[PDB]
Design a protein around this ligand. Structure first.
Ligand SMILES: [Cl-]
Ligand SMILES: [Cl-]
Ligand SMILES: [Cl-]
Ligand SMILES: [Cl-]
Ligand SMILES: [Mg+2]
Ligand SMILES: [Mg+2]
Lengths: 349, 349
């Protein structure tokens, strides 16, 4: 076990943990004690029919959702819904390479986990802890959208509404390559020590490089050209890196990123239907709003629109944001208003 | 001095070298013996009025131009024009960090060179070796386009026609950041040794990582999604890296790449007019066809269209290509026909 203050309640906000027991992974690995970190708001009604699940994204947790997306002034309204965010396996809050007490899967021995494993694990947690057998909606961004897609394909009758924001049901070759460069730059740091480092601070250079890779692909050319980063209260593009992006990624655990990156790379709901993507998305019964971000460079509108065309009864709702993919962080004035408007209309479906 | 077979006439095709003497650089540095590598096709006529200059791009030489762009079936017709490509200072063929006999500027001591320094050096070479004082056309791609823009702003009366392909006159913040990630991944290789390596093979990992960065930003999402690389005779996306892109970049000299990358980052014709880009491009007298590639991710059409609007008498001629920026390599079936049509129309003006 490693000590990283970033993966604590003080930084991420309060959360709970619960073990679902033994989890056999699709790739063949086993997590004997699979425990998950989750945070909730609101109250489950009598029929337990008002639950909303929020999967977390790469390098993220439940934090951004409770801070930016959730509130009585938002669509994700805790006065109406039992809202629960369940942290990804390996994401640093749930059972992960650097926090597991199981030596057989500690650090560099931690097994490959697929999107499918998270969804199975989440289903078990919801049933075990809350007796939730159906979800009012599943809402997630990026990797959270991947998990959202996996939910409505794997358990079609258990989800009534779906909001995959800025993500795809089947990972594309370009996205795969992009994520590979993220992995390569962390592994390139000699402090990484093959994933058996004594502290994340030893991989600071690798993590800083990944941040700069996110600066290049995570926003847009116009974001930088128009200096939209000024609404962060910063005075130079170099400051955006040095005082915001870099400290964020340098706070994270390398093995957590590498694990979740592998999961991200291999996201594919067509595994359920022999590689037939149309057949997989054809299984969807949840009312689905596909919501890409306009300037997203690696989850572009055309990729999400192509998948939306395969989902029966679905709608395409483009989120306009100059900040591209990292608009998920809510760095633009009209981001949350667009999210709230679309989610409200979805929740009325 | 280092021996690298990649930087020879055998690999790049026949060329010559000539010294233009002492060159004082804009950044304050000095190249006492500034010699340039150049390649020609065709014959300069009596009044020296049929000369076309082709600046070279990052990591490239005259090779791709003579192989893909030049011929009697092309607009760049050697039976009509004296076509001369002059290699960038520091590009491995011209005087460079790894080939200079001047120890004071060898390897990590090699000074910062700007686009403006190249254009001054080229003007001198043309005047000195051929008595050329005016150019029928200047044609260049990417960094070659930057040099093209610098030519028509710095020496407005010396260029009759200009064809900046896939490049801008003043570099944008996003492009700067992208190029920074290229430099960082080379510098991250411990074999680089602060630019004092004994062989480029010692920086193989760094060069390979940069190749993968080019895979992510140098094409487009659709290029990979449609597997457009299959018409290159490659059978997997992994092969595109391992069998085409990686061996190419692993053949190159790190100090050459870093030098030309710095040059690329700081390209700015507005230096001539106190930072006023509109005033700089307002000087242009050459008939100019601004030709961005439709899917170019870091020299996007909107960036080039914005600049074309400031150049009097110019036209915007978008090149449609799924391959994005690296469409410059001529990897698409309809690339050269678009280039030829536009250039012929330019040359007929
Ligand atoms: Cl993500
Ligand atoms: Cl978060
Ligand atoms: Cl270039
Ligand atoms: Cl070349
Ligand atoms: Mg709020
Ligand atoms: Mg030809």
């Amino acid at each position: 076990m490693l000590d990283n203050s970033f993966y604590t309640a003080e930084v991420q906000g309060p959360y709970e943990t619960a073990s679902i027991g033994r989890l056999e992974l699709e790739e063949g690995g086993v997590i004997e004690d699979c425990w998950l970190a989750y945070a909730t708001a609101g109250t489950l009604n009598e029929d337990k029919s008002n639950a909303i699940l929020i999967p977390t994204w790469y390098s993220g947790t439940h934090q951004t959702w409770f801070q930016q997306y959730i509130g009585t002034d938002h669509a994700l309204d805790p006065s109406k819904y039992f809202i629960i965010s369940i942290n990804q396996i390996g994401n640093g809050l749930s059972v992960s390479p650097a926090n597991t007490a199981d030596d057989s899967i500690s650090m560099s021995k931690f097994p490959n986990v697929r999107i499918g494993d998270d969804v199975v694990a989440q289903d078990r947690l919801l049933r075990q802890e809350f007796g939730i057998t159906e979800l009012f909606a599943v809402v997630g961004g990026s990797m959270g959208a991947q998990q959202t897609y996996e939910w409505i394909v794997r358990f079609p009758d258990q989800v009534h509404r779906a909001a995959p924001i800025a993500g795809t049901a089947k990972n594309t070759p370009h996205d795969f390559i992009f994520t590979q460069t993220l992995n390569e730059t962390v592994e390139a740091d000699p402090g990484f020590n093959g994933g058996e480092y004594s502290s994340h601070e030893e991989v600071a250079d690798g993590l800083r490089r990944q941040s700069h890779l996110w600066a290049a692909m995570g926003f847009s050319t116009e974001f930088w050209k128009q200096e939209a980063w000024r609404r962060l209260g910063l005075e130079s593009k170099e400051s955006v890196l040095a005082d915001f992006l870099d400290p964020l990624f340098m706070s994270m655990d390398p093995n957590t990123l590498l694990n979740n990156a592998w999961k991200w790379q291999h996201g594919d709901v067509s595994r359920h239907t022999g590689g037939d993507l149309a057949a997989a998305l054809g299984r969807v019964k949840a009312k689905t709003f596909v919501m890409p971000i306009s300037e997203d460079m690696f989850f572009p509108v055309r990729d999400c629109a192509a998948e939306q065309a395969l989902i029966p009864g679905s709608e395409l709702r483009v989120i306009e944001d100059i900040a591209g993919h990292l608009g998920l962080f809510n760095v633009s004035e009209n981001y949350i208003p667009q999210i709230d408007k679309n989610l409200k209309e979805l929740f009325e479906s």
